[model samples]
Target: GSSLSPQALAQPLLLQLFVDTRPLSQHIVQRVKNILAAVEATVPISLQVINVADQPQLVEYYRLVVTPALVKIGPGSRQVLSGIDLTDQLANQLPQWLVQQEGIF
Candidate 1:
């Protein structure tokens, strides 16, 4: 089998997308890892880590309302999530707000 590159490995598996705004914080990245662990501990979903700075396009796409925003992107829907409110809902929240497929697309 062919090996996947780091970028290829970063691709989501299901339909969920998580954009980490606090790209400068190691703690934030750790938290994201923890969230991934929590989810993998339960079910499975497609997850991606997008550095907003690396992709300025996302900043404009989501209107960049704020940092640490999680935009769920889908068929025709888009949702931009900012702050730590959804930190607790990281697992199931994706499926719920997944309507517009806002963030991770």
Candidate 2:
């Protein structure tokens, strides 16, 4: 049905972008995606979005103190990254996730 890869693409990254209703949050999320593209990442395993306005329960459940949070879904411990510099922070942390995924294969 479609041209395929030798192996299916790598596993989904399954990240969550916890954000609020703000242009700044939009900017941050977009920047995060840009970094992923720049690094040729995931081979991202996948990404999801959570909004405090729409998902207040998740906001409280996660105990988030900031908006534009980039969270990694996992057992090594959920990584919750938030701040003005989060784009850079997330970029720096992206490679480790790749290495962790390699640990499986």
Candidate 3:
């Protein structure tokens, strides 16, 4: 604790997507998959997909009475991804925290 670790300061983004078992959800899931894959390739992140059936408690915890959603997981006010402009929201929501970088010699 005496010294700070710069490497540790740079934590990979963590995200979780909520999706239940429904054929209709495939539309959303597929789009999310496509964008996340591309984002995953570029950004260092840990993504988890949790189902409402499995983590029933999370529903009450996150105050989500619905299924199939994407929410940011970290030290910030709650933010979620939904609807047809999901990808658009993704691009808009991500700040320089994502566009950050490191300098070296």
Candidate 4:
């Protein structure tokens, strides 16, 4: 079997996309990808998409009270960006997160 090691997947800026079957989840996914791409040339991170329906354990583990959330789980403190306005939130906060991630190690 060919699979990435956990360490390989554990980049400086770790992003986990938690979504349900809601229509908004689809839009959030696209919005996330678009924003990430806009910063792709300078900022690089591994995004792991997880469906909350299939990963109830994770949902519980992360203590998520909402869907369509973006969780930053590594290189610094765990931060979650949620709500319908998450795209703008990411645009504003990601740069600061990147700098914080760099300062971690």
What's the CA RMSD for each of the models? 8.1, 4.6, 6.2, 5.8
Per-residue alpha-carbon lDDT of model 3 for 13-51, expressed as tens digits? 776777787664566666666666666644565667778
Clashing residue pairs for model 4: none
- What is the RMSD of candidate 3? 6.2
Count of steric clashes across candidates, in order: 14, 3, 0, 0
**How does model 4 score by TM-score?**
0.74
Clashing pairs in 3: none
Which candidate, 2 or 3, has the higher TM-score?
2
Please provide, for model 4 over 1-105, each residue's C-alpha lDDT reduced to its tens digit, 9 standing for 90 to 100. 236544344354678788887879788878888888778754476677888889889887878777788887866677888886678777877787766645444
TM-scores, all candidates, are 0.48, 0.74, 0.64, 0.74
Candidate 2 yields a Cα-based lDDT of: 0.72
Evaluation by lDDT, superior candidate among 3 and 4:
4
For candidate 2, give the lDDT of residue 11: 57
- What clash count does candidate 1 reach? 14
For 1-72, candidate 1 gives per-residue lDDT tens digits of 336544433224343333545543345546655676665623344455666667778578667745565555
Best model per lDDT: 4
